[PDB]
Structure formats: structure tokens, C-alpha cells
Amino acid sequence: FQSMGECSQKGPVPFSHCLPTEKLQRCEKIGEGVFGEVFQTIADHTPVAIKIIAIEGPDLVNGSHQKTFEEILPEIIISKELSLLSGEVCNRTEGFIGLNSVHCVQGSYPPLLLKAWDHYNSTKGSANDRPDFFKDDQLFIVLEFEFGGIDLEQMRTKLSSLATAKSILHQLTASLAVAEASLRFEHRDLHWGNVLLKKTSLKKLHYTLNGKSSTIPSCGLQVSIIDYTLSRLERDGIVVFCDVSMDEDLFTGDGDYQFDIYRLMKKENNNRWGEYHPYSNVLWLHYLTDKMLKQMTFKTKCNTPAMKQIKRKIQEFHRTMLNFSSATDLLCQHSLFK
């Protein structure tokens, strides 16, 4: 059955099942990576994000081999488990992106999606191949997600002040703590492309950690964590993860603290990716804090002593947080969140 048993279709479906004409006509490309392509579209008056990944074929795509169904399953399972946290009780968070559906699709790439792909290439430029070379037996996974807003990297110059950065870090830390508590989760790839921001009218956001409910002032933004391609979790001692023990390229990047995090995770876990090392979540949170202080630039600087105080508190977080053992330890014990 399609969509993990929640769609009535069996066997692959055509793209038209996921992207009926009007939905497909409203697709605009919003993102990419070596994995494939991300489109935004609308249905029932509501934006969604569609992630499309080629699988099972022999062609290089964006310079890399396609994943098998077995290799893509972890991302699908982890997307679902983290989405479900929004509806749980003892460990509840809306801080991971909602998963609406997952389909296995068969066919060549829709020409209307090529149109969208071309528009992005013309205006922003793409590092990917134009996905026009797939035959009509090609398989894809199509993941339909809640539209989460705009990534933190694209918001580098767009946020109001460091007070917003405090809310963002708090929301991230809380979501990761809840996922640690419920699922022994590690994100493992939480670069600033994978932190999404969208406007909310809610003044505060709610989470529950091990049965204790708390709130976070929103500063008008809701944070969603995305992209579980490197993630790990477990339920009842069954571990779901991406084994990168024999990957070379992942540990040889340069030019950004991001690339050190892969090496630092490998140090922490002795290259055993099945194990649970929630310190990796601290490492990513440190990388994000570092971005907030070094690369983000805010419309309003810390001009008053009260704002210089928030700056000082985030600088204090940056220099102390690596002495905490997990996001849960940070959330529960760090002074920033009291």
C-alpha cells in the first residue's frame, strides 16, 4: 500500500496521483540538493513542499548514485515518526516538519516540473542536472510535507534582532530534546539549510517533555527542522539510521564549521553510527549558535543594554553548551532557557 498504509493504492503510482493537473501547474521550485528537488505548490488553499528523489536506477543523478528503496526507507520512517510527535502526549513537539504523504511514483519527469526547474535555474542557478533524462520506468519517492517557511541560510539578512535568534535556539533545543526523549533521535545534518522559519500569530509555542509541559516565546516565528537523510532513531531497540562509516567525502569538507561537525560526530561515536550519541545534537546546536553570532546579520543591532544582555547570554551559551551531554541536558539545565 502507498503512503505507509494510509493511501488505498498498491504498487507505484503515476506522478499525476500526487500532482493532479492544478497542483502540478502551481509548482515552483524552492530548493535542491544532491538528493533531488523540492517544489512548493498549493492544494486546498494550503502550501505544501514536495521532495522528489529518484531511486533504484543506474544513472548518476547530480553526480551521485541513486539510493535503493532499502536505503531511502530510513528517511521515510524518520520523517513519519518526527511528524507524529505533534500529536503525542508525554513527548510532544510541533518543531519537526509535518509529513502529509509519501508515494512511490513511476514515470519520466513531468514537463511542468521541468518548467519550474528551468525557472529556478534561470533566476537562482542550480548545481543539479536538469532532470529530463529519466525514462518512463524510473522510480521516485515523493514526500509531501507541510510548507515550513524559509531556511535560516536564506534568512541571513532578514531577521529582526538577536532576540529572534534566542527563540529560534530555544525552539530547536526543545524539539531535539523531545525527540531524544521519545525516540533516541539524532538529526546528524542540522546545517542552516535545514532550519525553516515561518510567521506565526501565536505568542508562545508549547511542547511537552517526559510529561512536563512548557512554553517558548515565539518572537513571531515558528521553527521547523527538516531533512532526515543522515538521522538516527530507535523504537523498541530497532535502530533506524544512515550508516556513513565507509563514506569518505562526508568527512573531508572544508570552508565552514559545518564540515567540522561531521568529523566531530565521527570522533564522538568512534565511527559507529548505529549507537546513540545525543551529543551530536549539541554539536549541531553549537554550529547553529555560531551561525547566529557570526554569519547572521540583523536588521536591528543590540543597541540598548537589554539587547546587549541577550547578545551576552547567547555568547555565553556558545562558550558553555559543548559541556552538556544532549539537547535534553541543555533544555533542562542551561541558564539561557530559564
Should residue 227 be labelled a site residue for Br ion when binding is judged by CB under 5 A? Answer: yes
Q: What is the DSSP letter of 108?
A: S
Residues recorded for the chain: 338
Return residues touching ligand EKK (CB under 6 A): 30-31, 33, 38, 49, 97, 145-148, 151, 193, 196, 226-227
Should residue 48 be labelled a site residue for Co ion when binding is judged by CB under 5 A? Answer: no
- The answer to the question of whether 297 is labelled as a binding residue is no
Q: Are 330 and 163 within 8 A, CB to CB?
A: no
Catalytic residue among 189, 249, 260, 329: 189
Cell for 112?
511542468
Residues numbered 170 to 229 that lie near Na ion (CB under 5 A) are 224
Site map (CB under 5 A) of Co ion, residues 4-43, x = contact: ---x------------------------------------
Q: How many Å apart are CA 254 and CA 260, to the nearest integer?
A: 8
- The answer to the question of whether 147 is labelled as a binding residue is yes
**Is 132 a residue of the active site?**
no
- The answer to the question of whether 229 is labelled as a binding residue is yes
Residue 114 sits at φ, ψ, to 5 deg, of -60, -40
Residue nearest to Na ion (CB): 224
Should residue 2 be labelled a site residue for Co ion when binding is judged by CB under 5 A? Answer: yes
Residue 57 sits at φ, ψ, to 5 deg, of -95, 165
Q: How many Å apart are CA 263 and CA 249, to the nearest integer?
A: 11
Q: How many Å apart are CA 142 and CA 278, to the nearest integer?
A: 29
Secondary structure E strands in 152-306: 195-199, 204-209, 212-217, 221-225, 232-235, 238-241
From the list 72, 169, 226, 330, which residue makes contact with Br ion (rule: CB under 5 A)?
A: 226
Q: Which is nearer to Na ion, 208 or 224 (CB)?
A: 224
Query: Which residues are the active-site residues?
Result: 189
Q: Given the rule CB under 5 A, which residues bind Na ion?
A: 94, 224
Q: Given the rule CB under 5 A, which residues bind Br ion?
A: 226-227
